[PDB]
Structure 1
Amino acid sequence: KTVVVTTILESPYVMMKKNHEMLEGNERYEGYCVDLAAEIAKHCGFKYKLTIVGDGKYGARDADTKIWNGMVGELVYGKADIAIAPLTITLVREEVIDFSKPFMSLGISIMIKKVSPIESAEDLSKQTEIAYGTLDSGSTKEFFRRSKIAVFDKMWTYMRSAEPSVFVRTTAEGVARVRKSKGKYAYLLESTMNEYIEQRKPCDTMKVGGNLDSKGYGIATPKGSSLGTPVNLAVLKLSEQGVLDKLKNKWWYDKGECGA
């Protein structure tokens, strides 16, 4: 029986290849996530099919609705069997569905135009001249929303009272807004995506400061599913063998079209 998989067309995790207009099957996708899905299928021994959630969202909770959108929505409501995609792990999504062991560690990063006058996020909180935003229905905004730290509370109060809407539809739109703003707009995003933007043309954006926290990416599984343990063991096996690191290097630094 073919197993349906939900994901999001995020680079370098998933790509559309180049001649996507004349490609079909599981060979029409290239990237970290599709290769990981193929490896998981080979290890478990099941046929898998890749699908993309119609809305370009990861998943969140609507106001006064209690409905899951994004990939977790497809997982919970019977529209998917496993989500192999860069889905951050937090407390809220852990209650509804179970996560495997993380396969990529990261944190909150600040990206800005190419010394930096803000450096630490403390100055950025204390300096309102440069704006800052996040991605809607992700995990960074959820982290900032319910943070009891004074600095993070001030940041979140800034985000909610922001004219116009500081949030963006996609991280590509976020970096586009950052580049077009000529350094007046900062982007709070995951470390991996920030570095990927940094190491590609035109190499105009750079990461500033350290990481505000520590997170990870997990392979979400429907609650009470028989496949959670096999895929968790497969993730651990890949981490032990270094296949995760090898694929990270393959899709991360093998090309390297920038001067670093």
Structure 2
Amino acid sequence: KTVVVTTILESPYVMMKKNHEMLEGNERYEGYCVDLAAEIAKHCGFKYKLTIVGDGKYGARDADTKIWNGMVGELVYGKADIAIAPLTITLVREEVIDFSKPFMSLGISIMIKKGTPIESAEDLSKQTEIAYGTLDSGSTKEFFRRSKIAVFDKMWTYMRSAEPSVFVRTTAEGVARVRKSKGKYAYLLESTMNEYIEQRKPCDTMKVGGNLDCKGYGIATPKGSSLGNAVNLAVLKLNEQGLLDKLKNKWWYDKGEC
């Protein structure tokens, strides 16, 4: 009867508490999604075990083998009951799993080292001296692969064959790469994560341009699962109560450094 919660380490959604060497199970982690977890549980009614996805990925279906990896996979292949993390709600995913009403909104955005000669996605697509990429197995990559919009199509045609690879394994790798590339690498990632990093020392990154799209994160559960209707109801209620906004103040604004 214990629901197993699959999630991923992504600041400030899920972070290792500073004294993680000890404290067991769910007491080891902290962050927005951890708090959201508890709330959903207390409101929906049930206990849960927080588990960090093995492959540390969000979720992509290998075109060749039609096999889903990451959190989406662990949901489609009975390895987890519910996914509570910043998992983007998308068309292709809504065909093999179920999402609640979004609990937070976001859009793809651009992160550059301060002083980089880039002010927009169009700027990036009209030059080549500055490389750029996204997270390897997430929705941002797939957004570009699929885009029909001229600019993003052009950006994708560049990214897929870019050498060396512009794709990263984690958000931290993308960010690091932006910081250690002397203004020669731009990173495309979701605004939520982009804005968090922007308010954290060394305060050398920046967000330029507007969001490239509008999307939402949602609690995910297996097709026709048992919690489906409940969680959506819990989410709508927390949204109603205004508790999701408060969690946002807690983890984003009340912790700026620049």
Instruction: State the TM-score, normalizing by the size of structure 1.
Output: 0.96
Cα contact 2:103–2:235 (8 A) shared by 1 = yes
Gaps of 5+ in 2: none
- Structure 1: which 4+ aligned runs deviate by more than 4 Å? none
Distance (Å, rounded) in 2 between the aligned partners of 1:155 and 1:41: 41
Cα contact 2:133–2:187 (8 A) shared by 1 = yes
SS in structure 1 opposite 2:60?
coil
SS in structure 2 opposite 1:18?
coil
Q: 1:45 Cα deviation (Å)?
A: 1.6
Q: 1:118 Cα deviation (Å)?
A: 3.0
Distance (Å, rounded) in 1 between the aligned partners of 2:187 and 2:52: 25
Q: Between Structure 1 and Structure 2, how many residues are aligned?
A: 258
Cα contact 2:116–2:183 (8 A) shared by 1 = no
* Cα distance per residue 1:186-225 (max 9 Å; x no partner): 0010001100110001100000111111111011111011
Partner of 2:209: 209
Distance (Å, rounded) in 1 between the aligned partners of 2:150 and 2:46: 49
Matches within 5 A, 1:165-244: 165-244=165-244
Cα contact 1:134–1:189 (8 A) shared by 2 = yes
SS in structure 1 opposite 2:15?
coil
Cα contact 1:116–1:208 (8 A) shared by 2 = no
Distance (Å, rounded) in 1 between the aligned partners of 2:45 and 2:148: 46
Cα contact 2:113–2:182 (8 A) shared by 1 = yes
Q: 1:44 Cα deviation (Å)?
A: 1.6
Distance (Å, rounded) in 2 between the aligned partners of 1:152 and 1:253: 31
SS in structure 2 opposite 1:88?
coil
Partner of 1:57: 57
Q: 1:228 Cα deviation (Å)?
A: 0.6
SS in structure 2 opposite 1:20?
coil
Distance (Å, rounded) in 1 between the aligned partners of 2:204 and 2:38: 34
Q: 1:9 Cα deviation (Å)?
A: 1.0
Distance (Å, rounded) in 1 between the aligned partners of 2:204 and 2:229: 43
Q: State yes or no: 1:5 paired with 2:17.
A: no
SS in structure 1 opposite 2:217?
strand
Residue identity over aligned pairs, in percent, reads 97
Distance (Å, rounded) in 2 between the aligned partners of 1:166 and 1:191: 19
SS in structure 2 opposite 1:157?
helix
Cα-Cα RMSD:
1.1
Instruction: State the TM-score, normalizing by the size of structure 2.
Output: 0.97
Cα contact 2:124–2:130 (8 A) shared by 1 = yes
* Cα distance per residue 1:150-191 (max 9 Å; x no partner): 211111110012111111111101010000011111001000
Cα contact 2:115–2:183 (8 A) shared by 1 = no
Q: 1:116 Cα deviation (Å)?
A: 6.2
Q: 1:26 Cα deviation (Å)?
A: 2.3
